[PDB]
A paper describes a structure:
The RADAR system comprises two genes, rdrA that encodes a protein with an ATPase domain, and rdrB, encoding a predicted adenosine deaminase domain protein. Here, we determine cryo-EM structures of the RADAR defense complex, revealing RdrA as a heptameric, two-layered AAA+ ATPase and RdrB as a dodecameric, hollow complex with twelve surface-exposed deaminase active sites. RdrA and RdrB join to form a giant assembly up to 10 MDa, with RdrA docked as a funnel over the RdrB active site. Our results define ATP mononucleotide deamination as a determinant of RADAR immunity and reveal supramolecular assembly of a nucleotide-modifying machine as a mechanism of anti-phage defense.
To better understand the RdrA C-terminal domain, we next determined a 2.5 Å cryo-EM structure of the divergent (<20% amino acid identity) RdrA from Streptococcus suis. S. suis RdrA adopts a similar two-layered heptameric architecture confirming conservation of the C-terminal α-helical lobe despite high sequence variability. Interestingly, S. suis RdrA particles existed primarily as 14-mer complexes with the RdrA stacked head-to-tail. In this conformation, although the ATPase domains are highly similar (RMSD 2.7 Å), the final four α helices of the RdrA C terminus undergo a dramatic ∼120° reorientation relative to the E. coli RdrA structure and flip out to form a protein-protein binding interface.
Residue numbers in the entry:
A (entry chain F): 28 to 115, 119 to 444, 457 to 535, 556 to 630, 645 to 712, 718 to 732, 745 to 774, 786 to 794
B (entry chain G): 115, 119 to 444, 457 to 535, 556 to 567
C (entry chain C): 228 to 341
């Protein structure tokens, strides 16, 4: 099941069409696309096909051969001489040698080498040498005719007569630019109607190489406005039309049909037995549980998942994620090589040992992203991402905000609250403002294209760092099992509790770094949870008057929705993801999705995830595309329904899949608390969440 | 000193040398009026250089295998390593890359040992002058050239074959103990941040290089230079590479580290010296992003006597403030102000206002940090020089006691002592 | 032992690398920072910063006393109370004025100008 079969059949059809005409006609072929990589490269395979059809194929002209600085005629005659010297005809060999000498004279004459250009007193007979160059067409024709005759005379048992000589110039995709121009002319002048020349270039390299020469050939025409680029491009157009008829040019395998096919077909192209199993690991025998018909496009994401526990397929397709997957077959093979096992995380065993390898796969994928993300980056974005990496754990948000604002400004000249945080502390940015600014930039009456992919890559980098920090925290789960227990005691029914939480935080630097990344809010602090009109009148503000009058379970309504302790004045944290001690008669703003990122609740969830082995997994804020899903959620007596959505409704949504569990809880302790309510007074989970 | 295979190796070496000469337009083919037929063989040696090189390396491996005694084992492959490519005359490495593409791509195991994106930039330097008229007429952009380079390097070195190691991130994240063990298992840092050898058992080797840097600048300069505001980009000083880390340890190993023993009196004299040494180290580190205004400013600030320095610092910081105003405040109203009317509180106030200005960022923050560090160094140096000459004014202390324990002679005496 | 001044090495390296990086700098692929970092690490490896020794700029030159400099030329040289150069002992000399204000005090006594 050769994968370029159609192209090979078309080549053979072209060769068929031209074989009928034998009157010294111009016939050339131009192969374009990704004809390369491991062992099914179209060029060698085509050469072999031509060999068994009685076409004599010159040894492939590689960039190594072209780097010799010899013209294609010199290469061809050297190959002819070597071929005839390989064996030891007489009658035709001597004529072949005479024509070779004549061609070498013509080459020397063109090089202004002969005595004609170096003698004061020209003689008559050297004028013959000049003729050898002015009649080079006939000499070359006779040379190739006699070469074919000599080759036919070395065939044993009278196999068959050779049809024609074929010259292939491989790996022309990148040969010193102007050099290929020198090649083209050489083919136009000496080997146009002499052989079957196969070019094997890419896209519009020929046109650009011709333009590079003609433009310096047309300075004074272009600057005086006599001609424009259109005239030069038309010249090149008709030249290439005559050199290679557009019915003789064959494209193959760009990115479109590369991404559209199935992973199974590509793996078969490498070997019939290779496949991908249900854990997106590369399999060999049969499995019968394999998933080989997913197409490379979404196989890419489904297989990044199961290795990084990150669903990186964006809800918004404006983000140009397809700029990562493969771009060519070589990149596809190399991606498979980098990404084949990396200790793929499966759905077996006790769902505990897959965390250590997961952060490693995160690092490897970050390296792969950096390799991919090194082309369109110019200077500001390499700089920004580099500084963002080594931004400790808390200056990164400030840098990201100001970088995104730099993008915002680049379209403002041609007020908004998310745009009013430049004279803002690094500890007053959080992650919700980053996402809010990226959305506002996604909806700005300005620049596009590159900006969208910059936003996507920033989201990917943030997700990678968040997952890495979360997994580092999970590795050090023992150090704070106790606080989980305490948290249970603390809001199952003060100040030592906060003290303990801070002590436990200090002993795990990774937990610090994670909580500092998501300072206190991964959702925009503007978000409308009620899609009925505007945002609110006084909906998101509370008072919290005094402890002696707070109702039961009030500690829950301080760490679930109430991530700040301020009146709602310069050097102020304003967020304090730690347990909060609120004063009397003060307005406080509510954020419905703060539970997952509070220190005590996060560590409760971490210990629950590591210790308990059932079927649920606590929700962890490790992916910003989770925020993409969150902003898309409906959320709609009013407060109760929104709270239930936070607790139960939220748990598009395939980005919450996780490699460790089937479903996702929000905070298991809310279940136990619900139990106590039953004492004081899917259906069961719904009723408790209510 | 084989015979059977050496002669073939020599023949292939001669063929390769011919091919090289032919590529150099050296042979008689390019210098003779009247070409002969057999020199066309020499051209072939260059048009078939791949096969000649393959045979050469095959026979070289055979000859090397024939010199093994006691039949140890057969050689697997030939490996070529090109070290210290991080900085080789730019375009020269391009000439190397092509040479590897043309002659040694599928012949050996080539190890490149370069840094970051040096290869891409070196290729671009050549392709850009190769694509003048394409770029200026708008036919192509940098993206096309970068894609060309991208796929070329993808084929030359598969991205599964490239290995990075030890940038600054994991360099700063590890512990000082691990690095010192990387130098020698017995080296460590004691509780006074001095380098120890035996065991101590009071050592602090798990502090990480990041804050070990500051904790060890302290105990030598008596200066806590870790900034409360992390916007200030102090991490631009600590190390940047392992070589810089080793050299920092070399410069900063004892410098008569000030301990918590004895009578806390003799550590002042060495403290100002360590201040000077650290100022030198800062100047060495702080010589890259500085362009012309800041070298100038800091130089003048040094030799600003002892009182024009504040004026210079204020006007330099105001220069930074202005560079973002076009795109009233009281701290900004001191340019037509005497040098003796600036003080140090206005310098700090202006640096804070610049830290909170709706304008430029990045470099400005680190400039503020370095100015603060320089001021702290000068203040500590002057304070310690004063402390050295403490006897000369013991009497005034006593007088001060008498003076506000309960006039005009008192002021007179204070001025004389000053 | 190199015996150069200030940042001559960095500037000399930049003069070469900049013409080595025309098309990188004009197309915005790199800035002066990259070239300066290259030079920085090259010079860091060539001469460790623990191996470089500075001496006697203008700061400590102006801070010392005229007597110390004159002793650096010859132990007996000094400056008298009229700011004239003396040799024997005077015992009325003023050698501890520092070069900074000795400069002005000695322009005075010759031009009658403070």
């Amino acid at each position: 099941n050769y994968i370029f079969s159609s192209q090979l059949d078309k080549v053979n059809l072209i060769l068929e069409h031209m074989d009928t005409v034998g009157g010294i006609h111009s016939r050339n072929i131009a192969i374009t696309g990704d004809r390369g990589t491991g062992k099914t490269s179209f060029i060698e395979t085509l050469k072999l096909v031509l060999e068994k059809q009685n076409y004599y194929v010159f040894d492939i002209v590689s960039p190594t051969v072209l780097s010799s600085h010899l013209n294609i005629l010199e290469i061809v005659i050297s190959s002819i001489y070597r071929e005839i010297d390989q064996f030891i005809d007489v009658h035709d060999r001597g004529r072949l040698i005479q024509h070779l000498k004549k061609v070498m004279n013509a080459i020397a004459v063109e090089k202004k080498q002969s005595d004609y250009f170096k003698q004061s007193k020209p003689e008559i007979e050297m004028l013959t040498d000049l003729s050898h160059r002015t009649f080079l067409d006939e000499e070359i024709k006779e040379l190739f005719c006699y070469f074919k005759k000599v080759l036919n005379n070395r065939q044993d048992s009278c196999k068959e007569v050779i049809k024609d000589l074929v010259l292939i110039i491989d790996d022309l995709d990148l040969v010193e630019n102007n050099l290929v121009y020198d090649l083209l002319r050489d083919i136009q002048h000496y080997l146009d109607s002499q052989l079957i020349v196969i070019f094997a270039y890419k896209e519009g390299q020929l046109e650009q190489s011709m333009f590079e020469h003609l433009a310096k050939g047309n300075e004074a025409l272009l600057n005086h406005g006599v001609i424009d680029s259109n005239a030069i491009f038309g010249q090149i157009e008709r030249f290439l039309t005559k050199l290679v008829p557009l019915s003789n040019r064959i494209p193959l395998f760009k990115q479109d049909e590369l991404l559209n096919k199935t992973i199974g077909e590509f793996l078969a192209s490498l070997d019939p037995s290779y496949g991908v199993g249900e854990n997106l690991e590369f399999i060999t025998k049969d499995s019968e549980k394999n998933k080989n018909n997913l197409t490379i496009r979404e196989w890419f994401y489904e297989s990044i998942f199961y290795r990084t526990n990150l669903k990186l397929d964006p809800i918004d397709i404006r983000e140009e994620a397809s700029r990562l997957m493969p771009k060519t077959l070589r990149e596809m093979v190399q991606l498979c090589e980098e990404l084949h096992s990396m200790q793929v995380i499966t759905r077996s065993m006790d769902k505990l040992a897959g965390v250590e390898g997961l952060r490693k796969n995160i690092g490897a994928f970050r390296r792969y992203i950096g390799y991919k993300n090194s082309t369109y980056f110019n200077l500001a974005t390499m700089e920004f991402f580099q500084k963002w990496e080594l931004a400790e754990s808390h200056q990164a948000n400030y840098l990201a905000y100001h970088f995104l604002m730099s993008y915002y400004q680049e379209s403002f000249e041609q007020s908004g609250y998310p745009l009013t945080l430049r004279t803002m502390e690094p500890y007053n940015i959080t992650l919700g403002d980053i996402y809010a600014l990226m959305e506002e930039l996604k909806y700005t009456e300005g620049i596009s294209a590159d900006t969208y992919y910059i936003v996507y890559i920033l989201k990917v980098y943030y997700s990678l760092r968040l997952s890495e920090l979360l997994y580092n925290v999970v590795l050090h789960h023992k150090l704070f099992v106790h606080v989980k227990e305490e948290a249970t005691t603390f809001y199952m029914a003060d100040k030592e509790y906060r003290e303990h939480i801070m002590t436990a935080i200090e002993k795990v630097p990774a937990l610090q770094a994670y909580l500092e990344l998501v300072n206190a809010q991964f959702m925009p602090q503007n978000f409308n949870y009620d899609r009925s009109g505007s945002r609110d009148d006084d909906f998101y503000l509370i008072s919290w008057l005094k402890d002696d009058d707070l109702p039961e379970y009030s500690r829950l309504f301080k760490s679930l929705f109430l991530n700040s302790e301020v009146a709602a004045f310069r050097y102020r944290n304003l967020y304090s993801y730690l347990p909060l001690q609120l004063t009397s008669a003060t307005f406080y703003k509510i954020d419905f999705l703060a539970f997952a990122i509070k220190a005590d609740l996060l560590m409760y969830n971490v210990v629950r995830f590591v210790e308990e082995e059932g079927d649920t997994i606590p929700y962890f804020m490790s992916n910003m595309f989770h925020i993409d899903v969150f902003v898309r959620h409906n959320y709609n007596g009013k407060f109760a329904y929104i709270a239930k959505q936070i607790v139960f409704g939220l748990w598009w949504y395939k980005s919450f899949d996780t490699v460790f569990g089937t479903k996702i809880e929000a905070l298991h302790l809310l279940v136990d608390i619900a139990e106590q309510i039953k004492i004081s007074d899917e259906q069961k989970r719904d009723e408790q969440a209510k």
